[PDB]
Amino acid sequence: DHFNKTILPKVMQVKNFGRSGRTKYTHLVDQDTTSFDSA
RNA sequence: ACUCUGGUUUCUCUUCAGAUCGCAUAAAUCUUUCGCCUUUUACUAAAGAUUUCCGUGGAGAGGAACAACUCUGAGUCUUAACCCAAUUUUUUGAGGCCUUGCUUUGGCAAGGCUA
Structure with a gap:
């Protein structure tokens, strides 16, 4: 974590x-589909 | 305004289940792909097909329990005060006769008499 x-x-x-224990989930803010100009 | 009909709850079982069985939502297996990958599991996440599990509805059967009683359905679903009525029904003067012509007599049609 210091890196x-x-x-x-x-x-x-x-x-x-x-490592072999990996998933497709990346962190948080590319799992977020919200825009900042819609609605 | 009446006669004949006649329940509800709950338990279990056997079957059929289309239906948002389910206005809720799990898991496993298999086949494809997907991300890791270092060996098995345990995994990542999409499709299809199977199951399993927590549930559900319909019908039928057998019990226990408010079962002894309405309600529902069917049925024409009963009558005298005040109206005897003046265009299609059952209290409405519309009633008849003859002549003429036709027709085998019968019968049919137009006319007159009309209180």
Whole structure:
């Protein structure tokens, strides 16, 4: 966690990189489908 | 304004289930794909098909229990005060006769008499 993960490659910006226990869920704000101009 | 009809609850079982069985929502298995991946599970998430589970409705049967009683249905679903009535029914003067012509007599049609 002390590593700056904002400079990692976007393939390294995951959880448990290299482990078999991984999922498609990424973090939070790309699971969010809300826009900021609609409604 | 009347005669004949006649319940409700609850338990269990056997079947049929289209229906939002379900105005709710789980899991497993299989076949495709999907993300990891280091070995099995345990997994990621989409489709299809199966099941399983928590439930449900309809019908039938057998019990226990307010069962002894209405209600519902069917049936024409009963009558005298005040009206005897002046265009299609059962109290409405519309009633008859002959002549003429036709017709085998019978019978049919127009006319007159009309209190």
